[PDB]
Design a protein around this ligand. Structure first.
Ligand SMILES: CCCCCCCCCCCCCCCCCC(=O)OC[C@H](COP(=O)(O)OCCN)OC(=O)CCCCCCCCCCCCCCCCC
Ligand SMILES: [Ca+2]
Lengths: 50, 48, 100, 49, 48, 48, 50
């Protein structure tokens, strides 16, 4: 974590092996709300979530 | 005569609330209540 | 780029139609739609009645950023469709809610 | 033909004017998904196979 | 982290909001400087 | 109307200190510490 | 895992007690390994001791 200066951000849940056996395959479809109110800090957050 | 001045002095305190509930929204966006207030602006204007 | 009026009715019509292509190659398994948005004044009750009357589709609603828009309708959509609700206010909150 | 290096997408463009020197961004997590019609020269008599 | 039992261990800060430029910090439950917690510190805060 | 001759005196001091402060201070504050070879400005956590 | 193995450290967080293992070097793993127990990876923003 802190003994070098590179720090791991590894999560088991995130892992592909973990995910395929977590659940079944899926057809998803991301909707993004692009109305005017979102512009600002919130719009910035959405692009990084998707 | 007497309340004619005060029926339109009561009208304008209703207009001041009608500007104080307008919720400004960024980049040309709206909600339902600002779309029923812009009609109200028309109603207020006619009386004056 | 953000601009314009929010419409959850044309947003979920376009989503369901996308979900029903059946000409293309598809997974055909869990069918789910997730919307990222801040606040909603409309629950769009009508679109869900028909497009997913039997709840085949799962809806996940995400409320993001620090804001004052109403979250009750979005939570309701998530509850109605057997999905879930997730807030994200921050960048460090993205990593455990988009995997959850 | 399959190799240890990850399969790459696009032409890599990094901006040197906006990497502060000591913060350590994510490296990689993608799977190495090379396809059979990309490990070898493609035919029509190999898409049949 | 809303309470003290959870406010332990380390966390990330992001510099200029880039989600790629991050650094560990230990998190710690800090009390405010000027606060209202007895009559004495409540008069200290009010003066300011 | 009594505070007229005061307001005129504030205005010949906001002008005087501006042309003094132009002639002395013009164009001096355009240099900052930058990370080597970046456009990223370098600070400590609580420094503007 | 991801903790200093130096004996003189002795952090000793509450609830937990660590192990100093002995770490033979190996083939089929191209790293030093211990066959007497399993390591534990906790991700970084997750506190251990919760
Ligand atoms: C007198 C009139 C009241 C003015 C308001 C002063 C009240 C401030 C006070 O009550 O001090 C409380 C202060 C807070 O202590 P605390 O925040 O808990 O910190 C713990 C240790 N760090 O606890 C303290 O440890 C500080 C106590 C310092 C006492 C303040 C000194 C006052 C001296 C003023 C005399 C000047 C008289 C001039 C009058 C002219 C006014 C027009
Ligand atoms: Ca909106």
């Amino acid at each position: 974590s802190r003994t070098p200066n590179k720090i791991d951000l590894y999560d088991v849940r995130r892992r592909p092996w973990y995910i395929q056996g977590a659940a079944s395959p899926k057809d998803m479809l991301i909707l993004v709300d692009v109305s005017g109110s979102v512009s600002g800090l919130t719009l910035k957050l959405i692009r990084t979530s998707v | 005569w007497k309340p004619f001045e005060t029926i339109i002095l009561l009208t304008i305190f209703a207009n001041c609330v009608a500007l104080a509930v307008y919720l400004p929204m960024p980049e040309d966006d709206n909600n339902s209540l600002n779309l029923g207030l812009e009609k109200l602006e028309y109603f207020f204007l006619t009386v004056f | 780029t953000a601009k314009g009026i929010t419409d959850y009715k044309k947003g979920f019509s376009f989503a369901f139609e996308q979900l029903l292509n059946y000409n293309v190659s598809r997974a055909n398994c869990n069918k789910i739609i997730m919307l990222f948005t801040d606040g909603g004044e409309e629950r769009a009750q009508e679109i869900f009645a028909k497009y997913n009357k039997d709840k085949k589709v799962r809806v996940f609603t995400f409320s993001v950023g620090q804001h004052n828009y109403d979250r009750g309708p979005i939570q309701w959509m998530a509850c109605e469709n057997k999905g879930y609700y997730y807030e994200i206010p921050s960048i460090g909150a993205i990593r455990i809610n988009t995997q959850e | 033909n399959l190799q240890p290096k990850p399969i790459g997408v696009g032409i890599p463009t990094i901006n040197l004017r906006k990497r502060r020197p000591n913060v350590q961004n994510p490296k990689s997590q993608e799977p190495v998904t090379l396809d059979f019609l990309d490990a070898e020269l493609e035919n029509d008599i190999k898409v049949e196979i | 982290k809303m309470t003290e039992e959870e406010c332990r261990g380390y966390y990330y800060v992001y510099k200029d909001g880039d989600p790629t430029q991050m650094e560990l910090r230990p998190r710690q439950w800090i009390h405010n400087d000027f606060h209202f917690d007895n009559v004495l510190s409540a008069m200290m805060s009010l003066f300011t | 109307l009594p505070l007229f001759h005061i307001a005129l005196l504030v205005l010949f001091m906001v002008i005087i200190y501006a042309i003094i402060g132009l002639e002395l201070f013009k164009g001096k504050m355009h240099k900052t510490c930058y990370y080597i070879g970046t456009d990223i400005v370098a600070t400590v956590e609580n420094e503007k | 895992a991801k903790d200093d193995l130096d004996p003189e450290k002795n952090d000793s967080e509450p609830g937990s007690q660590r192990i100093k293992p002995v770490f033979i070097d190996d083939a089929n793993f191209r790293r030093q390994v211990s066959y007497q127990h399993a390591a534990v990876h906790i991700p970084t923003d997750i506190y251990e001791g919760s």
